[PDB]
Amino acid sequence: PYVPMPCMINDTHFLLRGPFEASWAIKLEITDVTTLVVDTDNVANPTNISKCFANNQDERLLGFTMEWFLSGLEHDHHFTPQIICGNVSKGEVNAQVNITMEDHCSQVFLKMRRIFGVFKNPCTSHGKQNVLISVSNWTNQC
Numbered sequence: 001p002y003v004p005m006p007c008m009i010n011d012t013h014f015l016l017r018g019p020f021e022a023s024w025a026i027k028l029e030i031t032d033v034t035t036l037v038v039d040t041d042n043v044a045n046p047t048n049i050s051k052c053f054a055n056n057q058d059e060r061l062l063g064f065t066m067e068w069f070l071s072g073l074e075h076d077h078h079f080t081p082q083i084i085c086g087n088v089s090k091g092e093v094n095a096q097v098n099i100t101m102e103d104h105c106s107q108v109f110l111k112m113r114r115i116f117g118v119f120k121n122p123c124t125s126h127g128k129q130n131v132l133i134s135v136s137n138w139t140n141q142c
């Protein structure tokens with residue numbers, strides 16, 4: 001009752017409400033579109049992941065909600081999908097994670113299945129596919 005609240009809009013779209021009935025939620029979209037590109041300072045990793053969400057001081061529990069979400073997968077050095085931080089100042093998502101690799105994808109699905117419940121396995125999809133991560137308002141969608 002005081003922990004992050006998972007919400008599954010549909011197979012592609014997921015929300016994770018912040019603790020204590022937070023007005024915000026970490027949004028996750030599974031998509032085959034890439035909106036971000038590698039730069040010197042924009043690339044992060046699951047241990048670096050907390051760094052991508054530096055925009056807002058108002059909602060400080062965002063970084064915790066992420067370490068909670070990674071489920072200790074930053075400690076699995078075989079879990080190494082490409083993560084690219086986004087420049088929110090220029091209207092782009094906080095991070096895109098390339099989950100095209102099959103073992104990363106099955107390892108991401110297994111974590112999201114226990115969290116969000118059963119939904120369609122995106123690893124059956126072919127070719128490029130990403131998880132896009134950004135912040136949104138919570139509107140009691142679930």
Ligand SMILES: *[C@@H]1O[C@H](CO)[C@@H](O[C@@H]2O[C@H](CO)[C@@H](O)[C@H](O)[C@H]2NC(C)=O)[C@H](O)[C@H]1NC(C)=O
Nearest residue numbers: 008009010011012013014015029030031120141
């Ligand atoms: C899951 O729900 C989202 C919205 O909650 C749908 O997003 C729409 O996606 C279509 C493209 O397929 C766009 O044309 C719409 O503008 C989007 N609407 C919104 C509100 O984002 C998404 O389509 C749904 N998933 C599926 C498979 O239909």
Ligand SMILES: *[C@@H]1O[C@H](CO)[C@@H](O[C@@H]2O[C@H](CO)[C@@H](O)[C@H](O)[C@H]2NC(C)=O)[C@H](O)[C@H]1NC(C)=O
Nearest residue numbers: 039040041042043044045046047048049051085
């Ligand atoms: C977290 O990411 C930063 C950049 O986003 C990494 O910084 C550089 O990473 C490259 C290769 O990843 C190294 O060759 C540089 O020496 C790093 N520079 C600095 C100042 O760190 C950073 O290493 C990552 N954190 C890690 C790997 O613990």
Ligand SMILES: [Sm+3]
Nearest residue numbers: 056057058059
């Ligand atoms: Sm803010």
Ligand SMILES: [Sm+3]
Nearest residue numbers: 058059060061
């Ligand atoms: Sm907060």
Ligand SMILES: [Sm+3]
Nearest residue numbers: 076077078079
């Ligand atoms: Sm090893």
